[PDB]
From a paper:
The yellow fluorescent protein [name] (λex = 529 nm; λem = 539 nm) is derived from [name] of the anthozoan button polyp, Zoanthus. The chromophore of [name] is composed of a tripeptide (Lys66-Tyr67-Gly68), which constitutes a three ring system, formed by the hetero-cyclization of Lys66. This fluorescent protein is widely used as an optical probe in multicolor imaging and resonance energy-transfer-based applications.
Finally, in order to collect data immediately after [name]+-induced discoloration of [name] crystal, we added an additional 10 mM [name]+ to the cryoprotectant solution. Upon undergoing discoloration, the [name] crystal was mounted using a nylon loop under a stream of nitrogen at 100 K and X-ray diffraction data was collected. The final model was refined to 2.6 Å resolution with Rwork and Rfree of 20.60 and 21.50%, respectively. [name] immersed in [name]+ shows the typical β-barrel fold with the chromophore located near the center of the β- barrel. As a result, the backbone between Phe65 and Lys66 is cleaved, consistent with previous reports for [name] and [name]. Interestingly, although the [name] crystal had been quenched by [name]+, we did not observe a Fo-Fc electron density map (> 5σ) for [name]+. Moreover, [name] and [name] immersed in [name]+ showed high structural similarity with a r.m.s. deviation of 0.198-0.239 Å for whole Cα atoms. On the other hand, we observed structural differences were present in cyclized Lys66 of the chromophore. Although [name] fluorescence was quenched by [name]+, a reliable electron density map was not obtained for [name]+, suggesting that [name]+ can quench [name] fluorescence without binding to it.
Numbering used by the authors:
A (entry chain A), C (entry chain A), E (entry chain B), F (entry chain B): 69 to 230
B (entry chain C), D (entry chain C): 5 to 65
G (entry chain D), H (entry chain D): 4 to 65
């Protein structure tokens, strides 16, 4: 959910602007060992409840049986820098980020995210290409009965530093 | 502004299938859209326990 | 459905051998213009009915709005040669084929299929790597009320010719 | 042998979502497992008409 | 060298037709562990010598130190089946084959090949797309004083089998 | 040349540390239209001359005839943000950045870079992973007698922003 | 030590290449500020000009 | 015509290369049957041996 991104005043905030009607995205995941995941999400703001609804479909295949995913060898995603580019005539954005999953051995596991961010409303203002920096942590809090875990994120939009 | 306040509540419903394993997950959260911070708790309501790492789903909610 | 493949006597037929209980596969599609599809299928033989049941989930994203898929510029898949390799310790097969979709302009559109074929029964005999040659044609027979079309396939398993 | 005869009937149920468009397709067919030939007729029961080419689904049934 | 391909009557031999002047080709090699090689080749016939000259530039980067290439764990490429497609307006062919390097443990090391074959003179006649199956075997003949080895290659061009 | 990178106090400068002996690097370039370039570079300091020597081998194949490279439709690379990761046991760094070439029409031409940076002597101290942002501008100065041009590059190394 | 580096330095460039089978040679001279991360280089094609492709593909090569 | 080709022919090979920055030179001689699609070549590393990598990566190069 790219609404939970601190935007400075001088970069156009496509996601917050799309609200409350919301937006939809699709993302491909390409892992270095050939697994492929796709995700589709529908984000809508009920202003009555002051609440943000997420409806996600998530599919993935060809994770090797003894790979770090199926064997649960992963701790966290390494902190990242995503490139958000506009698509001038279609009024949509395109995410491109290279992601690393840290293995409990101290190594890495690479995935390519390619996202298409597409607002439900035809947007007035289109942003210029900028960056988003994310830090996403996970803590498993599984008990005897249910499997549960917590996530925390922090995302900030930036222009080029130069 | 645009229906958002500084503190907001979130709700997640994921339908998935990884490596032929079908599952379902729901979650609630709290987040600060202007501080770019969010914290969500997720619970598997079908296909528990998952045969794969929780990490691959993180960017999915 | 790789049961509709003529197998010679000297190549082990993993698919027909898996029956009637059947088998499951997952396939990634990578198109030259960045679209990604995933498909999962469950094939089961009801011997009562003499009938083959298919249950498929199909997801895909990031097809460009003015691409040949969204604009329906495709006639047929070009005839292909798939490489079926065993996976020795996991008792499963792995499809690898490069596919071309012929554009109505007379050009091509490339997709990489990577399939994992995985029988419900632990198989006695594992095949040696061989080839499958497919020819798949489509005819749209859409009317005013419903959208309908016919497919026909022909698939033959072969060893190397040398 | 293995539950198969030389002529056989087939049945297809696809649940999908392409580029955010959700759809459903069913089909029946006839095929000769030993001649490596099959012929199937498909009909969209939800999301007709499709916003994309029928070709991308062909290897999906 | 696709001059050394057995062609049937029914398919145009672009490669033999290019002689005695000859043809050039460029190939990309993408190994599954992220190594990337590039090869350019210039082929000429000396009709005086009945000898085919091969001038070859080959470059490679990012072979992992403790991977099968820098560890010499390869024995041979597996027999393959390349697809050969005409590019109608450029008067050139493109070559796509997924290649597999056999490891001593019994494993398999994937490398995508994408070639471009260019006659030195405008071919008057272009082939329709076809297959070429390849078997390519190596034998190290290295002594203490020199690193030497032998290759045998057998190639035959086929149309679609059905 | 990552010697010309402004490093802060808090991150180890592998590149300046490698001097005056210097470092070597290999890079793969994967363009979205299937072209593939490879570059090897050897960098040495002449302390006598206060001059940094660059010896470079650059090779490319499969640039489509009527694509933006062979048609000279590029103006400049867009400002980027590369990720730099230490390979702990090999005593080397890896560089991953998704690069974009601006077209004259206003379009965008993607190329994946994956680099390996190797000091000529075992570094005693390795950096932790970081970012390097780049701005790289070109100006053609070509006359009738010679093809010449100028590059300016500004690079700064950053840690994670949060 | 200073690893043989100065605030202001000089740079020389030799590129040997082949792109879609077209061979070429480029040399260059430049001025740089290693600690400021600022270089300016001038390049001349000395064999195989005029290049049939864009100079932009070589920029990250030098 | 016969495009300067025979049933039995001879082949010579020059490969100049660099792999993980290690430079090398290989030449070869061979005998071939162009119409039968059968070649046999012998290769010798003349500069940069012994190769730090597998000969297998060069096979499709020659």
């Amino acid at each position: 959910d790219r609404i939970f991104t601190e935007y400075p005043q001088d970069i156009v905030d496509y996601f917050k602007n799309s609200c409350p009607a919301g937006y939809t995205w699709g993302r491909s995941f390409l892992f270095e060992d050939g697994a492929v995941c796709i995700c589709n999400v529908d984000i809508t703001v009920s202003v009555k409840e002051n609440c943000i609804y997420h409806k996600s479909i998530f599919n993935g295949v060809n994770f090797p049986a003894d790979g770090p995913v199926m064997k649960k060898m992963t701790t966290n995603w390494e902190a990242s820098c995503e490139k958000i580019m506009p698509v001038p005539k279609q009024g949509i954005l395109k995410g491109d980020v290279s992601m690393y999953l840290l293995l409990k051995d101290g190594g890495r596991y690479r995935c390519q995210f390619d996202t298409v961010y597409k607002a439900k409303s035809v947007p007035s203002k289109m942003p210029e290409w900028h960056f988003i920096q994310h830090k996403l942590l996970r803590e498993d809090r599984s008990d005897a009965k249910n499997q549960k875990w917590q996530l925390t994120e922090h995302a900030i939009a930036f222009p080029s530093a130069l | 502004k645009h229906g958002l306040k500084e503190e907001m509540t979130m709700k997640y419903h994921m339908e998935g299938c990884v490596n032929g394993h079908k599952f379902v997950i729901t979650g609630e959260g709290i987040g600060y859209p202007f501080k770019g911070k969010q914290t969500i708790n997720l619970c598997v309501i079908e296909g528990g326990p998952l045969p794969f790492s929780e990490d691959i789903l993180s960017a999915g909610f």
